[PDB]
Design a protein around this nucleic acid. Structure first.
Lengths: 96, 64, 52, 76
RNA sequence: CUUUAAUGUUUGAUGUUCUAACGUUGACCCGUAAUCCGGGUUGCGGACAGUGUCUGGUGGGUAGUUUGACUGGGGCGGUCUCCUCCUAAAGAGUAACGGAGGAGCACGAAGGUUGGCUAAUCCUGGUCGGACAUCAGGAGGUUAGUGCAAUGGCAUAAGCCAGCUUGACUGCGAGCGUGACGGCGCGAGCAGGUGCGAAAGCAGGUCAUAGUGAUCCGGUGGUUCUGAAUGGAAGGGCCAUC
RNA sequence: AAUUCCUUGUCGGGUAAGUUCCGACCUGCACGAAUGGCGUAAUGAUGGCCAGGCUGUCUCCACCCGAGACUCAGUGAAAUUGAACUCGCUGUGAAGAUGCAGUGUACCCGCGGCAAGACGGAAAGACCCCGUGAACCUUUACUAUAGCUUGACACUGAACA
RNA sequence: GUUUAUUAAAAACACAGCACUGUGCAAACACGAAAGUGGACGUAUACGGUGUGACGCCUGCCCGGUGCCGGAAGGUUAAU
RNA sequence: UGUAACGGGGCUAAACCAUGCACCGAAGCUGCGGCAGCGACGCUUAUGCGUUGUUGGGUAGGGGAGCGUUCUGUAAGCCUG
RNA sequence: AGGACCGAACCGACUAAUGUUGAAAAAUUAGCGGAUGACUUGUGGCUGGGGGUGAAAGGCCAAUCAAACCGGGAGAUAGCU
RNA sequence: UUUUGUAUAAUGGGUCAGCGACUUAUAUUCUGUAGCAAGGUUAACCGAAUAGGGGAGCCGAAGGGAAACCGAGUCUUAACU
RNA sequence: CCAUAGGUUAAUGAGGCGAACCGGGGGAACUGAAACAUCUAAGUACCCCGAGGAAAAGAAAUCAACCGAGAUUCCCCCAG
């Protein structure tokens, strides 16, 4: 980043933001990973055991990426509108 | 050993989807009453790093 | 540069304020104008106050 | 001596010439005074810049009783 | 409450007296065969001196360093950012310690709108009045004026006068101009609300171009955005600003 | 003037002729009274000038005595060195030519000499500039610090006014 | 007399003399984180520092600036 | 320093002007033979082979393909009194 | 009697010449200054590097001194050659 | 070699032989090649052991926002043609 | 005065050396920041003390987050 004695670009521009501690422990889940776990019921413990989110994760969302084909029960996870539509279209059930 | 990131650069840039970098505009930290409100408004949204100085930010941030 | 800068605080109770300059030697009386307050989305009276 | 100062060039002049197809909002000429006057479909900005208000081809013409140069945007 | 004191007590300052801490490079005794040292008797000083921590002053005695660049070689002189003309070769741009001048502000109206008006200079006549004040008529046609330097504009006036007012609004912006970049500049139109006008419309500062300072750190106001077990808070973010 | 730039200031002495010297003058660029002023016998491998004697210092060099230089026999270096079949002149050209162009001169090779050239040899110029180079030194440059000094607390106690 | 051993012996340094200043003894000062030691087994007719340099005639005016000495009533001011 | 201001010898043209026809003159262009790069085109591609244009001065530098040297496997093989 | 006079040993180095790949990393020859004093010399000791010592030149501290020498940080750094 | 430019009278080399300068470790990006492919790959370690086990982790298939949060959308804004 | 200080015997142990590792007592600068003082180099170089075949540390007045883990030491991730 040195440009001669002239004030470098990474010092001419101002700093912004802050690092969120919640984002380091919040993950997102593709629709394709739902079939990979066993038992048909997804939550934090089963996803960690199946190595999908991470041991330190405390919150997780299911996203409309890929597609699910088998009935699956989502429990205690936030779900997007498109993901919810696909899950219910595939005979699923979402609870809190 | 691993390359050390330039922490000043890390507090100012973030990689986007296609590989570019976003940054905050300059001239908005202090003396503002003499600047036209149109200029301040245009300086509020974040911008993308230019092609000329893209190499320096990629060099300064080896770990995205 | 005798003209010093001030702020116009809204009368709507919101903390919003505009900013400008004035010549305090030849215009000692306070400034009052009607400006748009984007919090209440109405044009309210703004009164001059100390820049601090 | 006392003659070393000068100012940066302002890059004025005609930016789009006659018979050039332009998009709306594009600058045609950057001037100091009103050397060219705004005609049909051309507006005059804060610093007397003449800009196109609609897509079309630039047209230069001399009109008026004072022989003033007008810029208009021909329909296209 | 204006106007002050008593009994006792809460602790500071100054001064005097005392010995018991402490000092003794005063005298004597012992270890001892010893002008070091230690113990004892005594004399003088005495809560001072002296020493530790914290703190103000003085401190080239000592230590680490700084003391710019351009420059028809260096130093001295002059200059360093921004605006206008020429140099600049009829698009843009273009250098020299080239030729000439300015800016580091001003304005709550000197901004917006509606309505109205036309100067400079000279001639003739007229009380104080004069080459030059104000009045009337004529010639003249912008040689005048623009808050300020110069250039380009300006009569539909951008110049001058009056009424009403805050568009010197908030979030945005199709599309361009100029920059290596940071950035700087022009912009119709969309949404909310506002001013003038009967209305078509105009208004996102001033006829335009100088009137300026990136980032870090810190200050003020607003906003649960964030808040290290939890609920707050501190701190941080964002918006406005110093 | 150990000090006066203008300056060899002006006058007088010395010399035929004296930018130095000696003695005055004062128009002291910019002397001056213990960072001492002005004299001062004696003293000085101290600075300047003049005179007598003396002289190859000079006019102007000449001869002689030895030690080298020269030749013979014996031992036997060094700095330097891209390679050389290594001339003069005028011009050209990284602008001062043994080496290029034109021309002149010159059979091959030693020895004793001289030192004009090979921008000769010796020392990565000391003068000058440049490096956000170094070292010392100075100070009312910046920031510290040993030391000196000031106060609070501690070792440090008892009565009285 | 001394001095730049190895380009400078001098008008430079030193000198006896003069003057100012500090220092009352466990002296100032100096070398020492300190103990101690020199000064000195000396005591203001002494010792250290500074300037001047035998002797003769002298050393005149200025405390505004910067130091140093004396004073502490007032202004300002640290730790506590 | 030496002619030294046509390069020299020398020239009354062997100088200058105008017209015309020859010739010399370079690593330019053409002829013949050879090597290599990049594009068209076709083969039945050994994935590079006929023709066909055209290119090939080169520093800093970028790209591509190689020669040769010591050691390890192939290698108790092969060459050598 | 004397930091008195002339002048050897002894101490020093004022002028000139030679020598400058020297006999010598400072000397030789002819002159010169002090030569009973602040003289000179032999033996042993003490003062250590930001330190010593200096009749003071930034002189000297083992042919080296505006901060000795030896080892280490150390292949310091060098936008320069 | 350095230069705008050197036969240069600018630098370096007397000559020969030997030695002498883009390497090594760990991370990151790009190109070629090989394996597998919405998956790829293991590090310390166990193990008689370049096998096999080990998926602790990392990169990728989702991004927008400073963030809570939302999500093939997100941010600005009371709301965007 | 008792006593204490001191003195004389006897027994046991220590002293010095050694290449690296360890714990502790002190502790730079060249360098980087394109100068330099905060900062870096770095608790590195170096000096000193002590011990062992290892040393140091060590059995929570430790983390975690309302679920739990269970002394110290070292390796790979977390993670530049």
């Amino acid at each position: 980043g040195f440009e001669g004695g002239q004030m470098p670009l990474y010092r001419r521009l101002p700093k912004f933001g802050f690092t969120s501690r919640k984002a380091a422990i919040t993950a997102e889940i593709r629709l394709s990973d739902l079939a990979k776990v066993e038992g048909g019921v997804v939550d934090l413990n089963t996803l960690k055991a199946a190595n999908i989110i991470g041991i330190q994760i405390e919150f997780a969302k299911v996203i409309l990426a890929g597609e699910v084909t088998t009935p699956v029960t989502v429990r205690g996870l936030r779900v997007t509108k498109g993901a919810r539509a696909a899950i219910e279209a595939a005979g699923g059930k979402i609870e809190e | 050993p691993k390359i050390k990131t330039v922490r000043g650069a890390a507090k100012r840039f973030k990689k986007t989807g296609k590989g570019g970098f976003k940054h905050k505009h300059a001239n908005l930290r202090h003396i503002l009453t003499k600047k036209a409100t149109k200029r301040k408004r245009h300086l509020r949204p974040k911008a993308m790093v230019s092609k000329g100085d893209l190499g320096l930010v990629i060099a300064c941030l080896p770990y995205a | 540069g005798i003209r010093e800068k001030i702020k116009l605080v809204s009368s709507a109770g919101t903390g919003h304020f505009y900013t400008t300059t004035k010549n305090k030697r030849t215009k000692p009386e306070k400034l009052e104008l009607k400006k748009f307050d984007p919090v209440v989305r109405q044009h309210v009276i703004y009164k001059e106050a100390k820049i601090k | 001596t006392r003659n070393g100062r000068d100012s940066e060039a302002k890059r004025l002049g005609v930016k789009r010439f006659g018979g050039e197809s332009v998009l709306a909002g594009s600058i045609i000429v950057r001037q100091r005074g009103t050397k060219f006057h705004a005609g049909a479909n051309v507006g005059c900005g804060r610093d007397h810049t003449l800009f196109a208000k609609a897509d079309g081809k630039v047209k230069f013409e001399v009109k008026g009783p004072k022989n003033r140069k007008f810029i208009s945007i021909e329909a296209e």
